[PDB]
Amino acid sequence: DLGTEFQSMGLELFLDLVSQPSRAVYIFAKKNGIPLELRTVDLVKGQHKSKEFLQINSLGKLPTLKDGDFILTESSAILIYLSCKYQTPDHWYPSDLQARARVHEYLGWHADCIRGTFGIPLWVQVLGPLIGVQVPKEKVERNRTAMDQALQWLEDKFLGDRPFLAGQQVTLADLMALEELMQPVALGYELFEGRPRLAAWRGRVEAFLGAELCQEAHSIILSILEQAAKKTLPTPSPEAYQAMLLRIARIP
Amino acid sequence: GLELFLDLVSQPSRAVYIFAKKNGIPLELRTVDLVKGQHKSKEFLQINSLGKLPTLKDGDFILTESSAILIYLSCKYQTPDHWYPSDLQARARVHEYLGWHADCIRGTFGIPLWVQVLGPLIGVQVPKEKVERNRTAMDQALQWLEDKFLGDRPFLAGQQVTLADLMALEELMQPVALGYELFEGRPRLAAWRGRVEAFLGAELCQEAHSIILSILEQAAKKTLPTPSPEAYQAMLLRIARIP
Ligand SMILES: N[C@@H](CCC(=O)N[C@@H](CS)C(=O)NCC(=O)O)C(=O)O
Ligand SMILES: N[C@@H](CCC(=O)N[C@@H](CS)C(=O)NCC(=O)O)C(=O)O
């Protein structure tokens, strides 16, 4: 038992930029100059279900942080953990009791109404057809309606007449939300059209993060539909296939 | 004074109720009857536009989400550190559980109430295929609870009871109350429940679980309220997101 499933010199982030929470953690680290050894784990190929990866995260999900012997999953937990270990600027995760509660409030609602809803178009347009499975139209339509309702709440409850989702500055909440919303955008769902306040929010977040950073975070997802069309994606392993079938059958 | 809007039929409502009672945080409890539809009434929507429970009102500061409310209260009233430890890694274990919980527990464990009580109340059956898929999903999630989170440790995020255990126990009680004996065959999980329940106290557990433990019989006796049209609408949407 040599622990050769090989460490980098420092902090390791196991990720795939096709994944929304992977992109959120990637961006946070890059923007703050947190030195991470990025380890690519190819979801479509099934490397997350490889013997090697399951030794690191038994759940076989991305992203995963490895800080020495300390292995941490869940983007929200990773983002917060990095923020306090690397003492990032307060605005991301405010200390103030109430401003922090607003971030935790968004992250909780996000997990219910954004996560698991906005990623469905990749399954419909790319990943299902990749393994010969079509998502029924009734479900696609239901998903479109749910996305619309969630965006409406995003504007009305969280953003309102304010600049960011949880107050006056960019927080972990804005990062999490943007990267989920990018998944359908990259597949040609024009989510920001007809929604000016959300559109301006997007520009505000991207302006803050920086074009070059956004560009390289989103590169892979912005190209995936065209790659699928030209049949250049990996063939899923049997383990990825199993997981894919389960995810597709979780679509309501 | 603090106000907590809740219904003890609701899992996250129960989690917050328990935390506050156990720590003696003085709350004005404000019952909002979910089955009736009071959560979609105009007066409650003036409090939480999302129309969901639980909701906390601290002066003119209105906060939703049980996880966020639990953390807020923990800091506000400076409760024993173990619930929400300050230590960087012990804290992350709590947040890690809460994130996974929101994916794999919340939305899966509540389904049997919809299958057995709430759907039938408004004339809608959940298809057998979905009930079986749900049973399989609960069993996979329980397995992860035991293998990844508990392991051979006493609680879900370490050596002491945290917010994670409270959230987990109250979701797991929903099917238990409806006759799913999900602790059968799972010694680590059964032991964990014993530990948590011993810490909270028998009386507090009984108060928190009384309503959900009597709901099946209320459905059988036909004594549940008639949902408002707004509640009916929300019910139909919830039922249709069952996969
Ligand atoms: N709530 C988790 C979600 C993690 C997650 O489900 N990640 C996906 C990629 S976006 C994954 O690894 N899926 C592979 C699988 O479930 O087999 C987080 O934000 O970290
Ligand atoms: N993630 C939220 C979930 C809140 C929630 O969905 N509560 C349910 C009752 S358990 C509710 O109010 N449902 C009514 C509806 O959605 O119309 C939390 O833990 O507070």
Q: Which residue has the tokens 């990773």?
A: A78
Which residues of chain A have a CB within 8 Å of the CB of B69? 101
Q: Own/partner pairs for A244-247, CB < 8 Å, 24+ apart? A: A244/A127, A244/A128, A244/A131, A244/A133, A245/A131, A245/A133, A247/A123
Closest CA to A220 of A243, A186, A174, A189: A186
Buried b (16+ CB within 10 A) or exposed e, A2-28: eeeeeeeeebbbbbbbbbbbbbbbbbb
The residue type found at A101 is: A
Partner B contacted by A251 (CB < 8 A)? yes
Q: Answer yes or no: is the C-beta of B48 below 6 A from any ligand 2 atom.
A: no
Q: Among all chains, which residue has been given the structure tokens 């950073």?
A: A213
* Three-point CA angle A240, A245, A250, nearest 5°: 125
CB < 8 Å to A111, chain B: 99, 102-103, 106
What are the tokens at A6? 């090989």
Chain breaks in chain A (C to N over 2.5 A) after: 5
- CA B75 from centre of chain: 21
Which residues of B are annotated binding-site positions for glutathione? Answer: 39-40, 52-53, 65-66, 103-106
Distance between CA atoms of residues A92 and A175, nearest Å: 9
Pocket test for ligand 1, best of A61, A118, A176 (most atoms within 8 A of CB): A61
- Distance (angstroms) between ligand 2 centre and the Cα of A249 equals 23
CA of B13 to the centre of ligand 2 (A): 9
Which domains, and CATH codes, for chain A? Answer: 1-90 (3.40.30.10), 91-252 (1.20.1050.10)
CA B100 to the chain's CA centroid: 15
Cβ atoms of A250 and B111 within 8 Å: the answer is no
B54 Cα to the center of ligand 2, angstroms? 7
Residue pair A159/A197 in contact by the 8 Å Cβ criterion: yes
Cα separations in angstroms, B29 against B21, B42, B67: 11, 19, 18
Give the orientation angle of helix B66-76 with respect to helix A97-113, to 10 degrees.
160
**Interface contact B106, partner A, CB < 8 A:** yes
Report the amino acid identity of residue A238: P
- The token duo for B15 is 């989690």
Question: Which residue of A71, A75, A112, A248 is the best one to mutate when testing the B interface, meaning the one whose CB has the most B CBs within 10 A?
Answer: A112
**Ligand 2 close to Cβ of residue B53 (< 6 A):** yes
CB A75 within 8 A of CB A63: yes
User: Whole-angstrom Cα distance, residue B182 to residue B176?
Assistant: 7
Give the single-character DSSP code of A5: -
Element (H, E) at A29: helix A20-32
Do residues A118 and A180 make contact, with C-beta atoms less than 8 angstroms apart? yes
What's the resolution in A? Answer: 2.0
- A127 in helix, strand or coil? helix
Mutate to test the interface with A, among B52, B53, B72 (most CBs of A within 10 A): B72
Check: CB of residue A47 under 8 Å from CB of residue A236: no
What are the φ and ψ backbone dihedral angles of B233, each rounded to 5 degrees?
-60, -50
Query: Mutate which of B100, B136, B145, B149 to test chain A, going by most A C-beta atoms within 10 A?
Result: B100
Alpha carbons A177 and A20: distance in angstroms, whole number? 9
**Ramachandran class of B107: left when φ > 0, alpha when ψ lies in -120 to 50, beta otherwise:** left
Cβ-defined contact of A157 to B92 (cutoff 8 Å): no
Contact A75 B147 (CB under 8 A): no
Among candidates B224, B238, B211, B234, which has minimal Cα distance to B44?
A: B234
Cβ A111 vs Cβ B102: under 8 Å: yes
Describe the strand order of the beta sheet including B61-64 as a list of residue ranges.
B27-31, B2-6, B55-58, B61-64
The helix (H) or strand (E) run that includes residue A228 is helix A211-229
Q: In whole angstroms, how far apart are CA A112 and each of B65, B108, B241? A: 10, 12, 12
CB pair distance less than 8 Å for B106 and A112: yes
Q: Give the separation between CA A101 and CA B65, rounded to whole angstroms.
A: 9
Question: Which residue, A36, A41, A44, is CA-closest to A52?
Answer: A41
**How many residues are present in chain A?**
252
Q: Position of tokens 């929300």?
A: B234
Nearest to B50 among A85, A116, A153 (CB): A153
Say whether A10 sits in a helix, a strand or coil. Answer: coil
> Do B68 and A104 touch, CB atoms closer than 8 A?
yes
Cβ neighbours of B148 in A, within 8 Å: 58-59
- From CA B35, how far away is CA B222, in angstroms rounded? 13
Find chain B residues with C-beta within 8 A of A116's C-beta: 103
Using alpha carbons, list the distances in angstroms from residue B219 to B115, B116, B117, B119, B164: 12, 9, 6, 11, 31
Helix B11-23 vs helix B163-177: angle between axes, to the nearest 10 degrees? Answer: 130
What is the three-class DSSP state of A180? helix
Contacts of B129 (CB under 8 A, 6+ apart): none
- The residues lining ligand 1, judged by C-beta closer than 6 Å to any ligand atom, are A 19-21, 43, 48, 60-63, 74-75, 243; B 99, 103
Give distance in angstroms: CA of B120 to centre of ligand 1.
Answer: 34
Task: For tokens 């090697």, name the residue.
Answer: A52
CA of residue A63 to ligand 1 center, whole Å: 7
User: What is the secondary structure of A197-220 as a DSSP string?
Assistant: HHHHHHHHHHHHH-HHHHHHHHHH
Chain-chain contact of B103 with A116 (C-beta, under 8 angstroms): yes
β-sheet with A36-40: strand ranges across: A36-40, A11-15, A64-67, A70-73
- SS3 per residue for chain B: CEEEEECCCCHHHHHHHHHHHHHCCCEEEEECCCCCCHHHCHHHHCCCCCCCCCEEEECCEEEECHHHHHHHHHHHCCCCHHHCCCCHHHHHHHHHHHHHHHHHCCCCCCHHHHHHHHHHHCCCCCCHHHHHHHHHHHHHHHHHHHHHHHCCCCECCECCCCHHHHHHHHHHHHHHHCCCCCCCCCHHHHHHHHHHHHHHCHHHHHHHHHHHHHHHHHHHHCCCCCCCHHHHHHHHHHHHCCC
Which residues have a Cβ under 8 Å from the Cβ of A203 and sit 6 or more positions away? none
